[PDB]
Structure formats: structure tokens, C-alpha cells
């Protein structure tokens, strides 16, 4: 469950390119790409989080 | 609180009181030789054995 | 399971040297500076001595800077301080910190864990034995205002004197108060219980004196 | 001197769990089979070392 999460913030971070070509703080910044799974499934890391309000 | 005598290209100031803890990105400055108020987070999505 | 746990102490002549040490056990020994902190009677803590991890950086307060040494046996979990010359001023209850990192340049932490002080007494003094004397309730003048009657004990060395009224059978009204050193270099204190002055002449009251450094035990009778 | 401390270390995936190779050392073998004997003018299955 989401419980784990309600002492929890979101935080900004350093990325490589905003989109502009140009590199910014933002609050989108990756932090990690998995790719374990063989079926070409894959597990993406963000700052962002998701199901909390 | 107004400190009246220097210049505001002078000075620097930031936030230090918080209330809410975040995962220690590599893209974010450690305050402490080790790090405080630890608390821990479970990754969801484990792997698993499957047929294709 | 995490403690540190102190050792030696005891009475010590002036000009001579102690050696104090803690176990360390619940935590890993190698993560963590180590400082000694002591705390006289009737003061706050005071910072003593402490070393860094792998013996990096050693630190001494002024004044016992040319006194005391300090050092750490990893293999055995444990810490030792090494005092000389001890004086009177050295006399307090020393414990063993543990820090929260490996390092003491890190002004973000403070010590967490600590153990339980042992004492440590810097005397030219025998362990001399107490003198015990009655003390009368001036049942001519007070006795409108309920008696108070009590002992006092004198004249010893050794702190750890307990006093207590009918063997332990009288709890309720009584008063006890803390040693005083005296410049002779003994203590003495005193004890009081209060009771109706119509139970004066029908009660008989017992002030029980305990000194257990040397086995002496006195049973002292008080009367108006 | 304003200085900044950098450490960094490996360990082995959680997917090792899963998804991992086994160098394994080969030393002897031992031999079975399954035969059709037509004993009697009957099928019977014989299986043994
Ligand atoms: C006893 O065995 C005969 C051979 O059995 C066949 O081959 C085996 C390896 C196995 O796969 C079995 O299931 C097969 O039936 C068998 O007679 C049969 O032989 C041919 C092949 O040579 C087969 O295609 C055909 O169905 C059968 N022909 C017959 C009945 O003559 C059958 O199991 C049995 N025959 C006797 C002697 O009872």
C-alpha cells in the first residue's frame, strides 16, 4: 500500500535536457532505467510520485 | 527580518526547517557525513518467471 | 542491545594515576568515534577527552590536556582513558559517548548513546567510619506545632552512607538530605521525621545508620 | 575550500534471484535407458541403469 509514502516529500533534480536542447532543474529528472525483464518490459525511476496526493 | 545594513547582492539565505523526508538521489547534496531521519521505501514490481 | 558499559574507579590518592575503561557491544565499535564525558556533583556535563576513528585525531580539554591520555583497542570493542596526576578538582562521575560518525569535524551530530558513569574520588583521606548523635525535638517549645525530631551523621569519608528511621517501618514524614563535604575533607549529613508531639513519650524512634565501606552498622536512639 | 567527499560501490542485482548464469564443474556420467522388449509376443517396458 501507499502508507509508506505519508511521511514522504517529491524533490527537484539536475537534468541533462529540458527539452529545449538546454539543461534545467526539473521536477520530472530521472533517476534510474531498469531493464531486467527479457519481455522488453521496463522499469523507469522518477522523482515524480504517482497515486499520492 | 530586515537586517538593514548590507546589500541583497551581498548575502545568501535558504530553507532548513523540514518536515518531510526524500529518497538520497545522487543529484541531491548530503547535509551529514551520514544521513538523518532515515526511513525506508519498498520497491513495487518485483520480477518474474513467465511464459512468452 | 546497544549499550556501553563502564569500568573502574574507586578512591584514589592525589598525584596518583586511574585507569578507566568501556565495553562496547550492541553496535560495531569500528564505526564510531568514542569521547569520555564527566559530571562533578551539582554541575552539568563536561566535555573530557575523545578520539576520532583509527586514532586520526586526538582531542584533550585544557585541563587535563597534559594529564590524560586517550585510546581505543578495536580488536577487543573497547575504550580506555588513561589519568595521571590525578587532583581533588578531578573527582566526578565519568561516562563513556558514543558518536554518530567516524569523524568529529561533523558539527550536525550529537551523542547518542551513553553508559552508566562510574565514579571516580580524588582524596588524601581514609575510608574513616561516621560519628552518629541524636537530635532531641525541643518538645518544651513545639509542641502546639507537631515534633520534629531527627539525627545527624558526621565525620566520614566514603559517600555512600544510607539512613533510614525503624528499620525501614517509618516512610511517612521523613526528610532526608544530601552529604555536605566539610573542608576537614569528610561528609556529613542530617535526617529528620515529623510526628505528633502526644506520641513523644509513647513511641520510641530509631535512626538507622548504614555504612557499608565499613561494615558498620549504628542504631541510634532519640528522645526528647 | 569548499570540497565535496564521492564514494560509490557494486553488489549484485536482485534480479540475480532470476536471471543468472551457473558455471558449473563436469566430472563423470551415468548412463540409463528404456527398452521395449517383445517378451512373449507382449509390449513390456524394461527401465533400468
Ligand atoms: C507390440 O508392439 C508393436 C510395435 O509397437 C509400436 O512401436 C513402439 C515403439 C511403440 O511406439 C508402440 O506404440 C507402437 O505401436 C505394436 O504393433 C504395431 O507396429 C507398428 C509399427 O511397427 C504400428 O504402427 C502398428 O500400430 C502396430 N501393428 C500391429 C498391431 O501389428 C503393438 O504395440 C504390439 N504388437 C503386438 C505384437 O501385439
Known amino acids: 500500500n501507499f502508507n509508506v509514502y505519508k511521511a514522504t516529500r517529491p524533490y527537484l533534480a539536475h537534468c541533462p535536457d529540458c527539452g529545449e536542447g538546454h539543461s534545467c532543474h526539473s521536477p520530472v529528472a530521472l533517476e534510474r532505467i531498469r531493464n531486467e525483464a527479457t519481455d522488453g518490459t521496463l522499469k523507469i525511476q522518477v522523482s515524480l510520485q504517482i497515486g499520492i496526493k | 527580518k530586515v537586517i538593514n545594513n548590507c546589500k541583497v547582492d551581498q548575502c545568501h539565505a535558504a530553507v532548513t526547517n523540514h518536515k518531510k523526508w526524500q529518497y538520497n538521489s545522487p543529484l541531491v547534496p548530503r547535509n551529514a557525513e551520514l544521513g538523518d531521519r532515515k526511513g525506508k521505501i519498498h520497491i513495487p514490481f518485483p520480477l518474474a518467471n513467465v511464459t512468452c | 542491545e546497544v549499550q556501553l558499559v563502564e569500568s573502574g574507579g574507586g578512591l584514589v590518592q592525589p598525584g596518583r594515576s586511574l585507569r578507566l575503561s568501556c565495553a562496547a557491544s550492541?553496535?560495531?565499535?569500528?564505526?564510531?568515534?568514542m569521547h569520555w564525558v564527566r559530571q562533578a556533583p551539582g554541575k552539568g556535563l563536561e566535555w573530557v577527552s575523545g578520539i576520532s576513528w583509527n586514532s586520526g585525531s586526538i582531542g584533550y580539554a585544557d585541563s587535563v590536556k597534559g594529564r590524560f591520555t586517550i585510546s581505543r583497542d578495536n580488536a577487543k570493542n573497547s575504550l580506555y582513558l588513561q589519568m595521571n596526576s590525578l587532583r581533588a578538582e578531578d573527582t566526578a562521575l565519568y561516562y563513556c559517548?558514543?558518536?554518530?560518525?567516524?569523524?568529529?569535524?561533523?558539527?550536525?551530530?550529537?551523542?547518542?548513546?551513553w553508559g552508566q558513569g562510574t565514579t571516580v574520588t580524588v582524596s588524601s583521606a581514609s575510608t574513616k567510619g561516621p560519628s552518629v548523635f541524636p537530635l532531641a525535638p525541643s518538645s518544651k517549645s513545639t509542641s502546639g506545632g507537631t515534633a520534629a525530631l531527627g539525627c545527624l551523621v558526621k565525620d566520614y569519608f566514603p559517600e555512600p552512607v544510607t539512613v533510614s528511621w525503624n528499620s525501614g517501618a517509618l516512610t511517612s514524614g521523613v526528610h532526608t538530605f544530601p552529604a555536605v563535604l566539610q573542608s576537614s575533607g569528610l561528609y556529613s549529613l542530617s535526617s529528620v521525621v515529623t510526628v505528633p508531639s502526644s506520641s513523644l513519650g509513647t513511641q520510641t524512634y530509631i535512626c538507622n545508620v548504614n555504612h557499608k565501606p565499613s561494615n558498620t552498622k549504628v542504631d541510634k536512639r532519640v528522645e526528647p | 575550500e569548499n570540497t565535496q567527499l564521492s564514494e560509490a560501490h557494486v553488489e549484485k542485482s536482485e534480479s540475480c534471484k532470476t536471471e543468472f548464469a551457473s558455471a558449473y564443474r563436469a566430472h563423470t556420467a551415468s548412463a540409463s535407458a528404456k527398452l521395449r522388449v517383445l517378451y512373449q509376443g507382449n509390449n513390456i517396458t524394461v527401465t533400468a541403469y
Open positions: 559517548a558514543k558518536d554518530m560518525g567516524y569523524s568529529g569535524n561533523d558539527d550536525y551530530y550529537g551523542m547518542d548513546v
Open positions: 550492541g553496535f560495531t565499535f569500528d564505526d564510531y568515534a
